[PDB]
Design a protein around this ligand. Structure first.
Ligand SMILES: *[C@@H]1O[C@H](CO)[C@@H](O[C@@H]2O[C@H](CO)[C@@H](O[C@@H]3O[C@H](CO)[C@@H](O)[C@H](O)[C@@H]3O)[C@H](O)[C@H]2NC(C)=O)[C@H](O)[C@H]1NC(C)=O
Ligand SMILES: *[C@@H]1O[C@H](CO)[C@@H](O[C@@H]2O[C@H](CO)[C@@H](O)[C@H](O)[C@H]2NC(C)=O)[C@H](O)[C@H]1NC(C)=O
Ligand code: NAG
Ligand code: NAG
Ligand code: NAG
Ligand code: NAG
Ligand code: NAG
Ligand code: NAG
Lengths: 828, 49, 49, 49, 97, 49, 48
């Protein structure tokens, strides 16, 4: 059985397969993609009841009636109940029963009266509700009364106390699991409208992941502002006035009798059978210290609308208001001189100081400004005020201003703060010249991994600043170092018309008035893609004979087995590159391969690569195709092979004549080489401080570079939902609702929006290319200086004395396997 | 299901349990389920570029 | 087709290259609708002038 | 001139000014924050290095 | 200074909302209408922010050329005598600090 | 002399010191006015030292 | 050519305002509303 023990804290154990847990929705379930959403996935109980013990047996949302919960239990009010079945006769027979605050409800379905489904209700009546889908296998009820089948909300019952079954299994094999659920909000990896896996937005790091829509997180200095308190005390400050009050009270009574009584301060009261209408304010909310110059009430128009079952509406009347802007009328929560001034210091507090409303922390300040009464920044935010009764100056600092975190190896190691106390569970806080820095490290470390412009952070989170005979080494060891350099970006092209107007012909014929708008966009994209293709195409040289010098036999005791491009085409990808391409998790947001042969043949619903193609976001085929890259790299390897260990010995000879070409030392250096090669292929395949950390860095940088493209693409393809202040987000829906004269006046908003979206996306592209160009030039320089040659500088080609380097293909980039010699085992 | 649009409609061999309307990130419909027969009709736009 | 393109370029010369385009959908289209079952109680509204 | 001074912005604090309901509404603008602050962080990194 | 002032002052404009303060909106109206108010502010803020990004990226790419030039000019005219007129000043170069 | 002759611009400070920001002892200077909008001027790369 | 044309054509769009021309919009409305009308034109022209 795929039934599990829920862990303490209500978490699904992370390897569960969800083999029937549909993602619930009220509409339009998604096919593929990472989504962030609220779902009922925090479980107070799950128990598994088998057909041996199918019985009638209600469950209340307070948890009573539960079976033996598996693994964990809690007695909070659950909001939802989820039934996962495994017996195919399902809800076809037997019935579901429900208790409601004013009666009993029962759900049943019958074909012979396909199974059309009906309800019986007693305060007795019956209703047709819908039809049973082909196989219900999971179904769910909300305490608020929404009823869900296979993820879709079919109807409402209103509030419900308890749910019960008149159901029995078909065979002793069968069982169903019943679970009480409440809402979490979660990040879900949806595939084939299946769940694949989720993460809860519980911890801080999970807050980051839950709001980058990314399961991986790069290293770097991500900012956050910590969540505020769910509740606030209230503070109010006012100028003293001559106090007087008026009640406005609206009375409703009806049968399927609205009255105003008597139809410097005032207040409003309102007293399965009110709307703001067109007024720029809401009844009741008028109390929240809105102002008027004057107000008049008459039986803008606020219709009073009775509802039945949220299913019928009846405008039992209308209240009309006229108002002047100005002052002297304000809402007051309660009905002859002297202002109240309930003010709380230090607590983050909602305020209405001098009819400026906001949230913040009020504090006494030592400042003494004779001018003014309220002080404001350029942004218009309130900064501080003067108590006219005393001259006391107060400051209005917002709670929880942003911090910056330090993330490394997908953990938080340190946090810059603007306050002297610890937080987030960190241990110690040190003051640096412009900020505090909390962490859990202890300052014994001596080598950083992240560079805050002028500081380093090491693996513990300890911040560090950075800037007679002799014990000559007896031996020099070899080591391997990895550089990744981005070399290309895969060009994208947009068909401006089909993106903007979605193919609706009237919209296309309207777009022509936006003279050359689409031209100057798509033309910038095309020109970038040309230049990209030319500049990479020229850089990839070749030479057939030089390549053919490369074979694994042609290297003696140095086992380059994994580097030599595989036998196919001239060649296939070599083993290391194969490892990388299988290692990198492809993005869930934007597929950057393409295949358009299938996008209309229609045998299956369109995958992302076609889905974004229907909007015209045509990912072009990559300019540095695998075979061509393998051919180039092979030509480089055969270049440096151009006796194979004898050139190596010549270099060792140069760097140290008498030691490094002794035959015993030569053999030792072959051993060291084979060892280092093996250690790096180990680190790339799975589970050193100046060796494997390079591998970690390269894998981080590659995953990052993929991710940032996927997100640029997802921005553009996600703005198509945005309705830019028009009646509705679909052009076809607008033209159904409106005559052409008003239709164009609406659709012009969608057009002027989407063209802004493109004129941003083109900027993302062109800046990305200009960042890539410097990298490509640098990589070319490194090819010339440090594979076809021997380096004359330390560091520029690895931290070490240069011997030789190696080049391999990688996602949009090159990996340089530098190797260097280091002193070892010194003797005086 | 009160989503209005233009498209070629084609029966498709892919099958799912969940939901009724299948939609992309852009909010375009990609395919809808027939409640009574369980066939899934894919939706494909006319004249893609 | 090439003139149809020029009319989008607003130019009489069109430099060599790859340009994106979309063919034109037909002028008449079948209506098609699908809905959930519901109980029917149709009403007219008729305005006379 | 040798260097600008790197600047960083925080989306949610700027846009919503710390109103919790506004931030709950900003989730609907998918990736709308990410692509800004990333384009600032990466450039600041390059300037530092 | 101009770039930062522009950015931090767009924040004051109301972008056709009822008011430029979000707390004012949620105070005055009922959430279902206040939301389709506030989405104007949100879109306007995002627009201004995305302009300021382009100010930053242009300023970086313009300074990169100047920096690389300066590093060239120092690599010449302080670490060596210059070998041309004009490049390091009108006259015959001796040294530069 | 140069550092004295060039005058900073009241349109926006270009180096800030955050550690006193949340203490409230005074009304904020322009650096913390910015910082309350999430604009976070980072320390310059090339320190005077 | 196309760059500059795309610039100059943005003036014709009304940006949801009552009119694409400032004189007309300020004639036909009272100042406390014509002003927040012409706000729309200002914002559009700046984005262009
Ligand atoms: C489908 O639509 C309905 C409403 O249109 C959604 O139901 C609503 O769900 C939210 C949270 O999921 C409920 O809010 C909660 O209300 C209780 C009230 O005591 C409060 O304690 C909670 O903190 C939370 O605020 C809301 O009441 C509920 N009903 C309505 C009428 O809004 C349903 O979630 C939607 N389903 C999907 C998949 O979107
Ligand atoms: C999201 O889920 C899908 C599966 O539904 C993952 O895709 C598979 O991932 C495994 C690794 O766990 C690969 O070995 C398979 O080749 C993938 N197959 C398919 C069809 O995608 C996907 O990797 C998940 N996303 C993340 C970030 O883990
Ligand atoms: C749930 O509520 C009902 C009535 O309020 C009560 O009889 C029942 O005992 C409650 N269950 C629990 C576990 O308290
Ligand atoms: C209750 O449902 C049964 C079938 O489940 C049906 O025969 C009966 O008519 C319903 N009750 C009423 C009052 O319609
Ligand atoms: C820091 O250390 C303390 C005690 O050692 C621990 O409670 C806390 O969880 C740690 N936090 C991190 C992020 O390491
Ligand atoms: C600042 O923090 C350190 C430790 O983090 C503490 O020892 C010191 O007293 C604090 N100073 C002030 C003024 O709060
Ligand atoms: C190199 O290592 C591989 C690892 O499997 C091994 O099979 C091979 O025999 C070794 N030698 C050569 C020359 O490839
Ligand atoms: C694309 O079409 C070919 C046609 O033979 C098919 O083999 C391939 O699987 C299709 N791709 C997808 C993703 O269905």
């Amino acid at each position: 059985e795929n039934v599990f023990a829920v862990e303490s804290g209500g978490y699904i154990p992370s390897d569960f397969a969800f083999n029937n847990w549909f993602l619930l929705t009220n509409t339009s379930s998604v096919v593929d993609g990472v989504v962030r959403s609220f779902q009922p996935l925090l479980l107070n109980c799950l128990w598994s009841v088998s057909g041996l013990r199918f019985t009638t047996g209600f469950v209340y949302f307070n948890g009573t009636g539960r079976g033996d919960c598996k693994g964990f239990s809690s007695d909070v009010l659950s909001d939802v109940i989820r039934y996962n079945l495994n017996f195919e006769e399902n809800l076809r027979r037997g019935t579901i029963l429900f208790k409601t605050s004013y009666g009993v409800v029962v759900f049943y379905c019958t074909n012979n009266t396909n199974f059309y489904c009906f309800v019986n209700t007693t305060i007795t009546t019956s209703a047709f509700v819908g039809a049973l889908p082909k196989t219900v296998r999971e179904f769910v009820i909300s305490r608020t009364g929404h009823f869900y089948i296979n993820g879709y909300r079919y109807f409402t019952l209103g509030n419900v106390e308890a749910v019960n079954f008149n159901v029995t299994t078909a065979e002793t094999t069968d069982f169903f699991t019943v679970a009480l659920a409440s809402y979490a909000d979660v990040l879900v990896n949806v595939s084939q409208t299946s769940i694949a896996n989720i993460i809860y937005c519980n911890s801080v790091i999970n807050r980051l992941r839950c709001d980058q829509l990314s399961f991986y997180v790069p290293d770097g200095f991500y900012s956050t502002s910590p969540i505020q308190s769910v509740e606030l005390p209230v503070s109010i400050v006012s100028l003293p006035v001559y106090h007087k009050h008026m009640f406005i009270v609206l009375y409703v009574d009806f049968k399927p009798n609205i009255t105003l009584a008597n139809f410097s301060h005032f207040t409003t009261k309102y007293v399965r059978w009110i709307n703001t209408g067109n007024c720029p304010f809401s009844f009741g909310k008028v109390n929240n210290f809105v102002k008027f110059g004057s107000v008049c009430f008459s039986l803008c128009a606020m219709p009073i609308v009775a509802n039945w079952a949220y299913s019928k509406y009846y405008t039992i009347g209308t209240l009309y208001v006229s108002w002047s802007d100005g002052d002297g009328i304000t809402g007051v929560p309660q009905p002859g001189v002297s202002s109240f001034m309930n003010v709380t210091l230090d607590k983050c507090t909602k305020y209405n100081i001098y009819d400026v409303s906001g949230v913040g922390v009020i504090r006494v300040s030592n400042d003494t400004f004779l001018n003014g009464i309220t002080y404001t920044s350029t942004s218009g935010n309130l900064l501080g005020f003067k108590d006219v009764t005393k001259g006391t100056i107060y400051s209005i600092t917002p709670c929880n201003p942003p911090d910056q975190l330090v993330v490394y190896q997908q953990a938080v190691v340190g946090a810059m703060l603007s306050e002297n106390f610890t937080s987030y569970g960190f241990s110690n806080v040190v003051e640096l010249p412009k900020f505090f820095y909390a962490s859990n490290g202890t300052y014994n470390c001596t080598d950083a991994v992240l560079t805050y412009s002028s500081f380093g952070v090491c693996a513990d989170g300890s911040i560090i600043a950075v800037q007679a005979n002799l014990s000559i080494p007896s031996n020099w060891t070899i080591s391997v170092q990895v550089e990744y350099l981005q070399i290309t970006s895969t060009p994208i092209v947009v068909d401006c018309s089909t993106y903007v107007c979605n193919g609706n012909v009237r919209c296309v014929e309207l777009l022509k008035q936006y003279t050359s708008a689409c031209k100057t966009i798509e033309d910038a994209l095309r020109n970038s893609a040309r230049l990209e293709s030319a500049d990479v195409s020229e850089m990839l040289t070749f030479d057939k004979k030089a390549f053919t010098l490369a074979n694994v036999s042609s290297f003696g005791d140095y086992n380059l087995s994994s580097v030599i491009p595989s036998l196919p085409r001239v060649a296939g990808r070599s083993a290391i590159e194969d490892i990388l391409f299988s290692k990198i998790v492809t993005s869930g947001l934007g597929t950057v391969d393409a295949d358009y042969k299938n996008c209309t043949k229609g045998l299956s619903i369109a995958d992302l690569a076609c889905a974004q193609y229907y909007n015209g976001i045509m990912v072009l085929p990559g300019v540095a195709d695998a075979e061509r890259m393998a051919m180039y790299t092979g030509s480089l390897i055969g270049g440096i092979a151009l006796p194979f260990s004898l050139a190596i010995q010549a270099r060792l000879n140069y760097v140290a004549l008498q030691t490094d070409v002794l035959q015993e030392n030569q053999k030792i250096l072959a051993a060291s080489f084979n060892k280092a090669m093996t250690n790096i292929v180990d680190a790339f395949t799975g589970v050193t401080s100046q060796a494997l950390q390079t591998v970690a860095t390269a894998l981080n940088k590659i995953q990052d570079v993929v991710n940032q493209q996927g997100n640029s693409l997802n921005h553009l393809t996600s703005q198509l939902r945005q309705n830019f202040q028009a009646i509705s987000s679909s052009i076809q829906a607008i033209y159904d609702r409106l005559d052409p004269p008003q239709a164009d006046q609406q659709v012009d908003r969608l057009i002027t929006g989407r063209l802004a979206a493109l004129n941003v996306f083109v900027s993302h592209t062109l800046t990305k290319y200009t960042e890539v160009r410097a990298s490509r030039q640098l990589a070319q320089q490194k090819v010339n200086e440090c594979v076809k040659s021997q380096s004359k500088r330390y560091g520029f080609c690895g931290n070490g004395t240069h011997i030789f380097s190696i080049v391999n293909a990688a996602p949009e980039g090159l990996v340089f396997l530098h190797t260097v010699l280091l002193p070892t085992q010194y003797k005086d």
